Design a protein around this ligand. Structure first.
Ligand SMILES: N=C(N)NCCCCN
Ligand SMILES: N=C(N)NCCCCN
Ligand SMILES: N=C(N)NCCCCN
Ligand SMILES: N=C(N)NCCCCN
Ligand SMILES: N=C(N)NCCCCN
Ligand SMILES: N=C(N)NCCCCN
Ligand SMILES: [Mn+2]
Ligand SMILES: [Mn+2]
Ligand SMILES: [Mn+2]
Ligand SMILES: [Mn+2]
Ligand SMILES: [Mn+2]
Ligand SMILES: [Mn+2]
Ligand SMILES: [Mn+2]
Ligand SMILES: [Mn+2]
Ligand SMILES: [Mn+2]
Ligand SMILES: [Mn+2]
Ligand SMILES: [Mn+2]
Ligand SMILES: [Mn+2]
Ligand SMILES: [Mn+2]
Ligand SMILES: [Mn+2]
Lengths: 294, 294, 294, 294, 294, 294
């Protein structure tokens, strides 16, 4: 083989027909953006994450694991959703259709954004297959705005509870450091207390909030402090280090995580690919916690 | 005066109530953006142009003129349109209302984008006051797409002729170097021939196409080659130098230019403010050709 | 209102005649620079802070407060000092005159630099109205050089104690990580110990040093580690995180802070506006600790 | 189709098994680098060109052509050579093997570098299928060093004539502006005269030097002036504009060009993707001159 | 003196003939690079460190020391190794020869890379003069690859123990956060535990592993998290802060450190010189711990 | 020689005691800056030019010359003036003293700025040795301000004629594109006409203005368009290409040029070292036109 099908995330094989493949996990890129009050995310966050992820591919057993995820899980990259270039409605319809087809086939999904709005169609499809979920949500923002429209940025986790896709009472939002509503049922572990508490202390509280519910894990890269993730459309100071974030993600290993995504990487604002690298490393860690179960 | 009202473009006085002022020309910022197939323009193009324009303010008589524009014209900066943060429809309604109020009062407008879509509401208001206009359009793109919707990026100069706002047969598009429709009535002076012909030759042809019609002058900064204007959402190689562009704009002096704008400056892609500087210099040149008449 | 007077810091109203206004607090920009042994700060630090501060304006009650500062305090932005473009003497004379006029009128000041030298004229005016003050000083540098001239960079807090403007014995310098003089009366809480101690421990010591004296709060952004504040003229490694800095500023709430500034933001060295964002967030936090008293 | 095989250059279909496909032209990426006396090219030049090429894909008939290349030519992207990460010998052996297999199958090649050294293995394979070729070589450097080793950077066009792969007497080197050997048989059209002469004049001379020989076209992006192509390992001032370069490439339409490449794009030194964009546009123009024959 | 010999690191005197000088310590630059699977380091890491080090030179007694290193140690900068531009073998032969000549003369060495491969020739020369050493190694990578060739990147600390240059059983690797071999005798203090433990706790363990052996101290700047050191060829998230790193280096004061280096600064990926600044500050701290003994 | 005295511009030997050396030409760096109305130049322009100049050193006979300058001229680099870090008066006194000592010894000078103000002390020393000179001045600015003080930026060529150092009537200013005084005796060849006329036409006019007077050649890099020289404190659009500038400098070969400098390179605003590279190439061309006479 002089040229090869090893062109996707972590040099994994591409499969443009994933639904009836032998894959366990399928990576989908959704380079969807919408006009915001601040900067736009752009159309290259899936591409920047894939490109920088070659920094991680040489490790046979990614630190600190004692196995190779690739020998426990069959992971393929199906490329990008064609309708990510449509408006919020068109993108949502096609993404939910893509997701339902994969979940019905027994595949699970790691998806890369794109604006955080991509998580709402994913949650609609996941709720159909797995039932109402607990949300584990890393972000500087709660995204529970209740006064905007159905397709507005920052409203996904008002709509999701209203549609019964997630149980807010068993959901946790980690790293929040912008105005939020204390009485909507979500448990907000704000960045101030998360930076001051030990990882094990936070993880113990997350496990007790989530319980045994199926979990959708959604990681907005702007959860990280802008020193570690300058490449994002809506930065907020006082965030998490990449050390603390990856340790928190590893601590989620014993949860029943049924799907996950990483969103808001904005390459136009990245500095020496550090934001894309943090996103790729967190995404690989999400695959490792799944493979640790097998 | 220890602090002062000299905070706008070229340190000109700000006036947030311009409609009944003594101004001859009013500068308006429209930091409007929409989701595109490529990069987003962002919300700081008016701000970047204003900021860098201090490089030009120290010249009493801006080169190469033998007068000071500020002693012939009363120019104020009214800030930014509040609805530039709305969708294409909301922005258009408010911008056209703003423009009609200024033109009805006898003011004329230099406006800064923002996406090129801002020119369509401006043309609607200008046609009401001045009648059907000839368009002088600098761009790498013709923006005459006829198969998208009424608020889509790149459709403004299909809609404008259809609404009778401009006469395409007396309009000229300069710097085009992307696919265009040869039979829609616009005269396309593509960048290949514009770079090969003398300025006077091009200007003579523009004057004969435009004739004596009132002219709306719209300058997309991506008319300049990306070496001179890297800060734009839709770059295309093989463009104009800033030398040739400013010489072409100066050659328009004898036309009856009733309004003008400069659009598509994307500061997130700018390099050492050169794109914003070129936009500010072209905008100042547009004021000079007006003041040269007085 | 199609265009509006909401063009300043945090989109607050501009008022170019603040002295007899209804404002409680007035923001002044001083884009003053001087030749240094290292990099120059430039003339856009006030502008970069204002521009990025729109990221904070959408929060009605800025996290983590349970009120809106804008509903307790009348804050206006008076623009920039005209003489910030003069030499150190000319700038100082005009800034002190500006400040005395505001303080005599019962206004208080949040000022943005510009070089740290701007704090000396501010302290001269503040001492006249409030009496000798305790200085709370965040910096990597003590700025107590005693062998340079009266207008040299880095000498302000040798001159201030000599002129009786501050009491060094009740002043504290936080984040210092460059050579300093242990016996000049200032209490130096160096970055090594500040990074190792709890916030509450540091705050308790600051309160006991300062006591009940009126406090001038001056924040050099290079107090933050260059990972969080690369945009500064004189970076030093081993600094504070933005998390720790904002927590320290919040802990100053119960002090009698009569005036404050944020200096040394150098946009030419900024990376994705993170330094300007940290400066804008710290400045907003200073307004919140004032509004928390009302 | 919710996800698709449209992930390569210009969103063309990927085919990891191109040798027995229906393709007419096959794109291969060779992200090969070697230690140099100056900067290294890196491993992302194929990826940066592919990514930015989406700016060109929306044009059905790319300006200024009156047809769609994609409706005359079947072009696929086979990804990257696996051995581009080996040393100069390992890469050369695998690339020549890849190329021979494609040419023997009747495919033709557009290849992207990577260091310019990639052209030597390509020429070895092309000479086998097409016979000794005339080289049309755009570069600031002649790459005819005769005193280094067989795998050294900058020696390819000493070795190629010695191995009988090209006829130097019918080869032309365009844009040269570094020390060269006047008596080695190549015709050097240096950047000084190329910038001063008309395109048609240069093209007429190229046609007479090349005659009817089969042509290998190799474009080092550092032929362009660093204002247009800052993203390259070995910049030299006084180069070609992208306007002149694309016009020169279009003028080669009537030559018998049997293979072509674009090399030396160094994304770590690129500014707002302008170098990658120029490389992608030149590469698309090379496909258009081929499709213009059909 | 109108011009002066104060052109090297920290403005120290240059001496191009250091071997028979009065120097105690000699700084050597080795701008050596080799083709890697990731980015290349480049040829300006010695130059970038020297340039930014002027930020530290103004401190007479560098914080937090109570003496001036320059009054206890005679330090000169001998410039760069001429053969750093050769291949791994040529560079190694000349560097080891340079080092042996200095050590035989009673000088000690602070060296700047360049790729980490430069440490292997340095260790060969140091073992000859000081005997088998304990290695104190800061890195995200263990560089103990045992399946590559003798001159490959990342193999130095497989070869060194095999040649008896270091005792792996008394060596410690700090900050590791990539796949490593647990049973090769090195003690790996990975970044996860180093970030969670106190500095004194880590230092106590290092002292007990190293004992009284002579120590070679080698600092790969990619030990720091990419937020603090973006300018490096092989970044890995979850690293050390510059605060923790400098505190760890200061804690090594009581060890018998016979030579030291700082490697992998890649200026092409640096952001506002922060990586070069951290490297220069760590290097100055290494000189201070030596001067603290005198 | 394992390390070497080849650390200066073009890897030429450093000589910190140049006055009694065997040098014909001596390079001096003057990293002098002063507070301006725009950006500051900084303190690294000499260093950035030296660093990038290694791109030119490998050419034995620099293109397009048929000799090696280094075999006709003995050129050394004496480093930087120690007082460049003082104020305009202190710097001027020391620079003029440095220059007088070199010129009295029969050396000639190529100097690198630093602010353009450095040329005034150089002209004072040159007039003493060579007599009143003709100035050949490349710039976007005339620097003839007559209403500022004796040490202000932009006043040098008001003061120089007043002190009889240059004859304005035989001096020419090339590339001017900012407000200038038409009646002060200088001949202004503005960038508009210089870009439109042939090089030979401009050179013929320069030769006739200058005649046989001794010439001081001073090149402000902001003569180049900001696309080619973004790294400068005072950019102005519509400038010269680097092709045209180097051709103009080569055409000055037959003039009696007694000294020369290159100023205003501001590395903080440079993009991929292109401005420093253009400055280094122009400086090398100035040495070649001198060596062409021998
Ligand atoms: N939350 C954000 N990401 N941006 C600000 C928009 C305001 C929330 N409706
Ligand atoms: N024309 C542009 N600016 N972008 C590409 C969109 C395609 C035109 N409808
Ligand atoms: N302290 C600084 N900000 N810079 C260094 C100048 C030396 C103190 N006189
Ligand atoms: N030619 C280059 N690309 N670099 C300089 C190396 C010297 C030629 N042997
Ligand atoms: N370890 C590195 N620095 N890079 C990856 C190469 C793989 C180790 N042989
Ligand atoms: N000319 C400049 N370089 N800057 C503007 C200052 C105004 C001239 N006195
Ligand atoms: Mn979010
Ligand atoms: Mn968010
Ligand atoms: Mn347009
Ligand atoms: Mn356009
Ligand atoms: Mn300070
Ligand atoms: Mn400071
Ligand atoms: Mn080449
Ligand atoms: Mn080349
Ligand atoms: Mn840049
Ligand atoms: Mn290493
Ligand atoms: Mn490493
Ligand atoms: Mn950057
Ligand atoms: Mn000048
Ligand atoms: Mn100038």
């Amino acid at each position: 083989s002089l040229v090869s099908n090893a062109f996707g995330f972590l040099r994994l094989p591409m499969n443009f027909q994933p639904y009836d493949s032998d894959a366990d996990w399928v990576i989908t890129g959704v380079p969807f953006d919408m006009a915001t009050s601040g900067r736009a995310g752009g159309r290259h966050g899936p591409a920047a994450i894939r490109q920088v992820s070659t920094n991680l591919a040489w490790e046979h057993n990614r630190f600190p694991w004692n196995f190779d995820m690739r020998e426990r899980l069959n992971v393929v990259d199906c490329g990008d959703l064609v309708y990510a270039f449509g408006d919020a409605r068109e993108m949502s319809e096609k993404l939910q259709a893509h997701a339902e087809k994969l979940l019905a086939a027994g595949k699970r999904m790691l998806s890369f954004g794109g604006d955080h709005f991509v998580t709402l169609p994913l949650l609609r499809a996941h709720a159909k297959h797995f039932g109402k979920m607990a949300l584990v949500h890393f972000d500087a923002h709660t995204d529970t705005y209740a006064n905007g429209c159905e397709f507005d940025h920052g409203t996904m986790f008002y709509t999701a509870p209203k549609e019964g896709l997630i149980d807010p009472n068993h959901s946790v939002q980690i790293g929040i450091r912008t105005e939020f509503d204390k009485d909507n049922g979500f448990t907000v572990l704000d960045a101030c207390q998360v930076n001051d508490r030990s990882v094990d202390d936070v993880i113990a509280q997350v496990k007790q909030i989530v319980g045994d519910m199926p979990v959708y894990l959604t990681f907005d890269i702007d959860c990280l402090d802008p020193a570690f993730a300058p490449g994002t459309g809506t930065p907020v100071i006082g965030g998490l280090t990449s050390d603390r974030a990856i340790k928190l993600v590893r601590g989620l290993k014993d949860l029943n995580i049924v799907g996950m995504d990483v969103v808001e990487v904005a390459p136009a604002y990245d500095q020496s690919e550090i934001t894309a690298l943090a996103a790729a490393t967190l995404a690989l860690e999400m695959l490792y916690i799944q493979a640790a179960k097998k």
